[PDB]
Design a protein around this nucleic acid. Sequence first.
RNA 1: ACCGGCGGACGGCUCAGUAACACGUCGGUAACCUACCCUCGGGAGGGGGAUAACCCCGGGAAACUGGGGCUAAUCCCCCAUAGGCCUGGGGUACUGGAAGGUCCCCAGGCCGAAAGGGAGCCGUAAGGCUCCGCCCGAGGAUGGGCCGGCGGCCGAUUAGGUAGUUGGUGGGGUAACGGCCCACCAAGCCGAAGAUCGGUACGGGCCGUGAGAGCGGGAGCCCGGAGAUGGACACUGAGACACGGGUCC
Lengths: 242, 96, 124, 107
Amino acid sequence: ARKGPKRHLKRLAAPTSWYIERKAYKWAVRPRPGPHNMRTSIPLLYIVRDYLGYAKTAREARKILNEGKFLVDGRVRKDYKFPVGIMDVVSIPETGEHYRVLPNRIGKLILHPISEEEANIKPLRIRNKRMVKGAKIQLNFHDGTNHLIPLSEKDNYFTSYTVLMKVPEREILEVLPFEKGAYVFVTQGKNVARKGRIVEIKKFPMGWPDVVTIEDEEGELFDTLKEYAFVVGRDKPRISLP
Amino acid sequence: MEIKITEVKENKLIGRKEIYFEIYHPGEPTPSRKDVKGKLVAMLDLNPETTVIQYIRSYFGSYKSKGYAKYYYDKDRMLYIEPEYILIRDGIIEKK
Amino acid sequence: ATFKLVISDPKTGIAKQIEITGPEAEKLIGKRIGDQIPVKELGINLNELFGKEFPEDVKMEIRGGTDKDGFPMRPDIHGPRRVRILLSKGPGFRPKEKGERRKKTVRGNTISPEIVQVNVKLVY
Amino acid sequence: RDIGLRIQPPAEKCDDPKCPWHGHLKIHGRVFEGIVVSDKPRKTVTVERQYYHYLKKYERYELRRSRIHAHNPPCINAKVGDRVLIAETRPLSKTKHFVVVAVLERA
RNA sequence: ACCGGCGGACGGCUCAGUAACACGUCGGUAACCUACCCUCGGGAGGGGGAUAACCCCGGGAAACUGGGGCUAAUCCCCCAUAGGCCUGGGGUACUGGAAGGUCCCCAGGCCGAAAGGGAGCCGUAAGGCUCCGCCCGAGGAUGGGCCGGCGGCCGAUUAGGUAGUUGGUGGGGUAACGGCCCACCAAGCCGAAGAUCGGUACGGGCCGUGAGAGCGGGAGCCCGGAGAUGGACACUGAGACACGGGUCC
Ligand SMILES: [Mg+2]
Ligand SMILES: [Mg+2]
Ligand SMILES: [Mg+2]
Ligand SMILES: [Mg+2]
Ligand SMILES: [Zn+2]
């Protein structure tokens, strides 16, 4: 990139969280800017063609997408470069199937089949919170989306809390606090894909990140970064997890 | 030659069904496309006009070959989806 | 000095070309761009050429011209000399690209014997 | 007042806008501890820290030293020979990128 | 075919220069920019103008290029409102380890938007109903800029080097911090633990060899850097001082 932004992406330099054959061809799809980040998302074309196998070539995959056969979080997506990330819901209504995108035990993205009723709710982690003109509170979630709340409820929401949002209407229906005894699911790091309950929280000076301790089902304790812990329930998960 | 069906899958999005099969034929040459298509349409009650044989492949020291084919429910959909070259190769349409 | 004259009628959009040389052409030498001169003084059968009745005392003003090598005249350069300057638009340059500039050779304002074509328009 | 270091602030105040305790300066990044070895220029000190480097082939150690120039607020005013604590900030001059925040042991 | 929009700054090639924050690695930006993309909150009122294409006449050996007539737009220009930026005085609503930050109220100024446009149906018509679009604000994402600590060649038959040089105060300039550049005040800064100068060379993941410890190389594939006959300098643009764009020697 001597004079401007990059537009291409070699197969060997593709993110390590995809299921893709790195030596079969030369090029890979460079994802469009969108909801999640590079390390936690995958272009839609690979979902249509490689994962589910509904298409054999890229050309016929685009014909499927242009007809509006795929729903991501309840909205039609036609761009084959659109990124799909953690906790998203992929729905095919014509075949009546639904999946949730989750990291594997080794850090790769997989599709987890889910019920139809569960397909209407998406958990969003409150990543940041700020004041906005007219004296309102804006919440910025982990997938880049935003929400507005009045000044009256400023004490019901804090960072690292989880909000259950009904899609595609984007309506709040549940708030899960981040506290001792809450049920969490790890999304990155060495202990990815493990789940459990919070035991302790530690803090450090000069802006180092804070750590949490989690007890799993069998009673073992392990530590991880606080921002890598995703709250999913009070004492039991509210969503299906593998 | 003996034809054995391995798997049949339904693709509602495209609007077609995909067929994988094996052909057992010791001491005989690789079967022609016409013979395989005739045998398949006889075996599964398919309209021959909307049936495309994607490929027939032989192996090094085997007595059997592997084949893959597709069947469309509508002629216009087949013309709209399939590449031109495969239709010419299968004799469905005439080359210019 | 022989001049090839292009007389344009603005009231109809039709133009005519005649060749003028001799003492009459000597009168035209020295004028800049943007000044009138009666055609009768120059001496021309205006009505016969255009096949149209014309008002009396009509005069024509100098609009442009080209030299014997094909270089044009630019109204914003004083004097009769020929120069080579960097241009971005205006007469004597067609850009073809946004923000493009190129070095071109042009003439000046004053008419000189080197000029061959002279474009003028009728002013009723 | 607290700036995230969890140490005692200086005794008195100053008017320097570049003082992290009383001005507008912000600190973020690495924090080091060292010995002052020069204070000739105005509001500037040189701090030296020593460490050991391991030579893999000869399986032995050698001593190396690192020298850093730091800003010296008037409210602290460190001198030659004492232990100081320095923190990283935005660039302040051609060679100054740290500021003294505490004197741990006066000479 | 022409006007208009987007792209042509990626990709492709080579290793001349460079011993340096160029590269590897851990961190920072509360000191910064970002067209295309995602979410949320709002807006689209009133006027004006030229010209290509097209017709008449051409100039020049050509490369190129002149005058006159006529016309449209998601082309161009104004007015309003929204909005942005600077400084002074108050209140403490937010994030964060910590506010020259964000939010609210007064006051003086400067800058200052938009295309309800296009396509299809039901409409006798009236008007809907989808699809693609235009502008402003808050955040993200993508792609970058800048900074710091540590790590990796040879020479003493090169021992002293530096004078905007090192730091301070007050400014300018930049997207942004900074001797980056000025005015003024001081005498600092580096060095036998090898400065300065000279030689050689793009850095790394890696590759060859050996029981190992080591010794030698770093063209081909990936990531980063630099260049377009040599040396200097600009226009447009979100992004260049631009390999198939411009100017000088
Ligand atoms: Mg390029
Ligand atoms: Mg070289
Ligand atoms: Mg205006
Ligand atoms: Mg080397
Ligand atoms: Zn102080």
